[PDB]
From Swiss-Prot, chain A:
Highest classification ranks of the organism: Bacteria, Pseudomonadati, Pseudomonadota, Gammaproteobacteria, Enterobacterales
Keyword Nuclease: no
Organism in which the protein naturally occurs: Escherichia coli (strain K12)
Subcellular location field: Cytoplasm
Domain of life the protein comes from: Bacteria
Keyword Transcription: no
EC code(s) of this entry: 6.3.3.1
Matching CDD domains: PurM
Subunit structure of this chain's protein: Homodimer.
Protein name from the UniProt record: Phosphoribosylformylglycinamidine cyclo-ligase
Transmembrane segments: none
NCBIfam families given in the database record: purM
Primary enzyme class: ligase
Length: 320, 341
């Protein structure tokens, strides 16, 4: 009861004109609208945000995981829901989470149109909580990005990440335990290590939506669980191989610290962590200069990261 | 020593292995509108052609307290049906046709057997609802979920024509109320069920009720009313639909009724199913509390004009529903919204 009164303003402030047990009409511009949907959790980053007592941006990570997966197919995020499960409801912690959710929905252009708070005393111990996200997007049927147009000679453009995002934090913590350092006191390029690790996931919705209107995009890969190895081949057609130019960008320093402190090997770094790349965009080579100029001039760190070449190799991704 | 994800406790390919097993039961729920398959970054589904001004109806749910009792008695096949039922039954309240469903599964270490049986119930509920299971998420949080505990959440999206949204405005003095029988407590009132089971010292497995174990009455999967309600809206003027969930008769009936209207419930029009008499006896529960906590055999109530009752009862009973006239609507002169007599 004390929660719904505090979150009524954050639901109303995200309301789109299409919003009217949650009612939402389709945007008027779509002729053959196709609905794009997905659900997600934050992951182990919750328990790291709990240990540091900072839940401010954890709701941004939840929305970002959703909406970045929708926009891969060219979908425009429409509305969002959450399922907040906890043992004993901390009104202050839940309000901070939902506020971060509202902030992520505003960056995505979608409305927080409802949700539920459930209390399970025997299941969750302490003040722990698990939040499930749900987003629905709309894409024009003729403009769905399926990756079939990915051909030999396409160039890969990377979008820089704000940090580890919401994947790999089970290894992050395990590295913190063996190293035995305080993330709040361990300074790292002028900031504490905790700030590098708790940085919310970058939301790529608006910049990728602008890119699709202006250049011909063949495929987009959101680097989440599994990193480069698992997520890049999901958008590759048969008999294609992505060759990442490792020298084309420097790792953000947080990933250097994680490798040294955990003695993490090369292949494992690119599986568990994004290593500074939030998304990879496959597009024809003549479109690259237009895309790089658009993305970099509109709040993104974009650079040429690799190429797609014809290859029947079973190793679909090469990082050399 | 080179640390890795293997040294921790999350296995990304555990959910990938679960998706590897459940691809069969998921594919069987696929609708013609569904495009693509599992594994992609997002689930694709077109709008049904019938809607010229389609409005999307969405909801999230969790079976909650009933999930606790399902683990205790070590039965997790029907709890997926309960998850879908609470979603899809709420969609049709406003006239929405269910389109697709997603689920969020969280636990400590993933038991692929336990999860696949839960998903199989979710897929079965989607078959009954006419919607598709088009995606989900499987998260492993070893420190947060102790023992074999797991938490599942459901999300659903339905479609309704803009000009046909049911908002209770068409409810008028004289509308006859038709009840749809429930299959049991459905998914609400299970904190009181657990309490009654404790104060009475009752093991619901070694306790027989009408020849069946009491655990079969308590954990009966929620009845899904989607196909019956959609046909009702298509063939009969439906003014309001009450979904008796948390809060029983007192809370859920006025939620769909317009202001200055009152629902009069004929208590003699039905007898409580035996599971509710047991819960009332074993807990010494006031009947007013039973009408607040449990649905008491009535899962849904439909408001419609009086001349259309016989046709509606004919349709509902034809789909295997337990339908009967439960009451009427009358103008509330600033009175009580629900009256059971
Ligand atoms: N965690 C949450 N996030 C957003 N909205 C919520 C949440 N929990 C409840 N609500 C909203 O609060 C109202 C009452 O929800 P309930 O308590 O489930 O009846 C509805 O409008 C819900 O959508
Ligand atoms: N519990 C689940 N039930 C149904 N589908 C799922 C579940 N978990 C994951 N999926 C689907 O499996 C695919 C793999 O998702 P990801 O784990 O993000 O690679 C996606 O299409 C998901 O929607």
């Amino acid at each position: 009861n004390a929660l719904v009164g505090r979150i009524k303003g954050v639901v109303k402030k995200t309301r789109r004109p299409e919003v009217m047990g949650a009612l939402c009409a389709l945007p008027q511009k779509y002729r053959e609208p196709v609905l794009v949907s997905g659900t997600d959790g934050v992951g182990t980053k919750l328990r790291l945000a709990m240990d540091l007592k900072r839940h401010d941006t954890i709701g941004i990570d939840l929305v970002a995981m959703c909406v970045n997966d929708l926009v891969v197919q060219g979908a425009e995020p429409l509305f969002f829901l959450d399922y907040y499960a906890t043992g004993k409801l901390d009104v202050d912690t839940a309000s901070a989470v939902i506020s971060g959710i509202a902030e992520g929905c505003l960056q995505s252009g979608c409305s927080l149109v409802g949700g539920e708070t459930a209390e399970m005393p025997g299941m969750y111990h302490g003040e722990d909580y698990d939040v499930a996200g749900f987003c629905v997007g709309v894409v024009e049927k003729s403009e769905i990005i399926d990756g079939s147009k990915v051909s030999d000679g396409d160039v890969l453009i990377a979008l820089g990440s704000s940090g580890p995002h919401s994947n790999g934090y089970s290894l992050v913590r395990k590295i913190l335990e063996v190293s035995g350092c305080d993330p709040q006191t361990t300074e790292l390029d002028g900031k504490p290590l905790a700030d590098h690790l708790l940085a919310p996931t970058r939301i790529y919705v608006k910049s990728v939506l602008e890119l699709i209107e202006k250049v011909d995009v063949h495929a987009i890969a959101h680097l989440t669980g599994g990193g480069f190895w698992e997520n890049i081949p999901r958008v590759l057609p048969d008999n294609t191989q992505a060759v990442i130019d490792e020298s084309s960008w420097q790792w953000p320093e947080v990933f250097n610290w994680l490798q040294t402190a955990g003695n993490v090997e090369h292949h494992e770094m690119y599986r568990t962590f994004n290593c500074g790349v939030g998304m990879i965009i496959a597009l024809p080579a003549p479109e690259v200069d237009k895309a790089l100029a658009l993305l970099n001039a509109n709040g993104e760190n974009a650079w040429k990261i690799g190429i797609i070449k014809a290859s029947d190799s079973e190793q679909r991704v090469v990082i050399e």
